[PDB]
Structure 1
């Protein structure tokens, strides 16, 4: 059918939506017809999200959420339920190597567990996990990226297996080197070395992540689950 009908009738929760990849996802799910709730860690972030949605003709809301807190999670979901409805599309974009991976996976799990009750009841759902962008400094940066990706992949596949019988899919998107504020002011030598390892020869656009998410949220992705889609211009780091 028509693109702006793809998600009509669905409420999407997108964490970390005030800028960058998260904002582009919020706008793309809106354009596909979802009601969109974007989150930020501050009140002004939340308000910016609400304004950006309105400016682009997307219905929904901006909210304050801290995915590391049980209380923030439970309160936020109760707010959404009462005022907008049950979020059946959930995009986790809000985030040395050990602590970071362990904490991010704990956060994914907390949020996922909380939104699954609604999806179990509806017998339908989409959980999409967004991995971290390539950039960070070092052999340490490489270590950290490969570890986070490996944890993201394994988690996503496990959770998909658990929830599959309820027609809930769980997938992940693993970005490579994407043009965000974080990557834009990386020293020129690191940026160049990164470009030289990307077959397409350019950075990815936030919108190019968002499009993949939008597809995974759609009905035609209903038999994709447990998958991690790399969006990296052909640069594979393991």
Structure 2
């Protein structure tokens, strides 16, 4: 019986890939906090359900779904399902992503190819499947979650750096083809953010990373979410082709 005010993304259908944990989770919760219908994906039914429960728990309408962004067939079918029963996503956050770390001399075929196809080729798969939706609406937001490593580089990560740097090149190029239809395309490049993955790293390696961080701390996933939530709003209608780095000053360009 309380009726709250309409928020910046009220009514917009949003897709957020890899939403079961850390940054993707926080993005989903933030878009929902702002009124979107949120559709997050994970690689497993168990992730896909964790998502539905997290949306339900925070009062957010939407769905948790299974998407493998490395598979052509999984993308087309999940996206056809979304279109059939859920809505046409007008905000798409590509956050799905993986690392396969090794010096390039120690690097196996799979580790290279997997990272490229998961972090980079996915942007071709998701965008191609959603763009017709945005073009009819004459409105859209594609937001690709890149990484500090794209512009900085990092030993052990020629693969990741390659895929994430390509993600920003893709961002720019697509901004160029879709601006006429009032669809913006922007990249968000997190620095070192406190998550499942990064807590596994050892305390000497972490105490060192902090030394390279002017802000003297790791960021919180929420801090990525908020930036993404902004790029999705009308307030960022004039921003496109951009890369916003959210790194506490670990990297400046």
Q: What TM-score does the superposition give when structure 2 sets the normalisation length? A: 0.87
Contact 1:20–1:181 (8 Å) recurs in 2: yes
Cα deviation digits, residues 80-102 of structure 1 (max 9, x gap): 11212110000000125576235
Cα deviation digits, residues 148-191 of structure 1 (max 9, x gap): 44222211101111111111000010000100011112111110
- Report the 3-state secondary structure (helix = DSSP H, G, I; strand = E; otherwise coil) of the residue aligned with 2:186: strand
How far apart are the structure 1 equivalents of 2:5 and 2:114?
Answer: 40
- Name the structure 1 match of 2:216: 201
Q: 1:103 to 1:18 in 2, by over 3 A?
A: closer
Contact 1:91–1:127 (8 Å) recurs in 2: yes
Cα deviation digits, residues 169-225 of structure 1 (max 9, x gap): 000100001000111121111101100000000000000000000000000100100
How much has 1:68 moved relative to structure 2? 1.5
Contact 1:173–1:228 (8 Å) recurs in 2: yes
Q: 1:145 to 1:194 in 2, by over 3 A?
A: farther
Contact 2:148–2:251 (8 Å) recurs in 1: no
How far apart are the structure 1 equivalents of 2:79 and 2:139?
Answer: 17
Q: 1:97 to 1:193 in 2, by over 3 A?
A: farther
Tell me which moved more, 93-102 or 15-24.
Answer: 93-102
How far apart are the structure 1 equivalents of 2:159 and 2:93?
Answer: 22
Q: 1:214 to 1:3 in 2, by over 3 A?
A: farther
Contact 1:136–1:142 (8 Å) recurs in 2: no
How far apart are the structure 2 equivalents of 1:204 and 1:4?
Answer: 29
How far apart are the structure 2 equivalents of 1:151 and 1:9?
Answer: 32
Q: 1:22 to 1:50 in 2, by over 3 A?
A: same
Aligned residues: 238
Q: 1:236 to 1:122 in 2, by over 3 A?
A: same
Q: 1:139 to 1:58 in 2, by over 3 A?
A: closer
Contact 2:8–2:234 (8 Å) recurs in 1: yes
Contact 1:134–1:178 (8 Å) recurs in 2: no
Tell me which moved more, 166-175 or 78-87.
Answer: 78-87
Tell me which moved more, 74-83 or 133-142.
Answer: 133-142
How much has 1:4 moved relative to structure 2? 5.4
Contact 1:10–1:89 (8 Å) recurs in 2: yes
Q: What TM-score does the superposition give when structure 1 sets the normalisation length? A: 0.92
Tell me which moved more, 147-156 or 173-182.
Answer: 147-156
Cα deviation digits, residues 37-90 of structure 1 (max 9, x gap): 010111111011001000000000010001122221111112111212110000
Q: 1:61 to 1:224 in 2, by over 3 A?
A: same
- Name the structure 2 match of 1:112: 127
Contact 1:135–1:141 (8 Å) recurs in 2: no
CA RMSD of aligned residues (A): 2.7
Q: 1:28 to 1:174 in 2, by over 3 A?
A: same
How far apart are the structure 1 equivalents of 2:153 and 2:201?
Answer: 12
Q: 1:25 to 1:73 in 2, by over 3 A?
A: same
- For structure 2, the 5+ residue unaligned runs are 98-110
Q: 1:2 to 1:105 in 2, by over 3 A?
A: farther
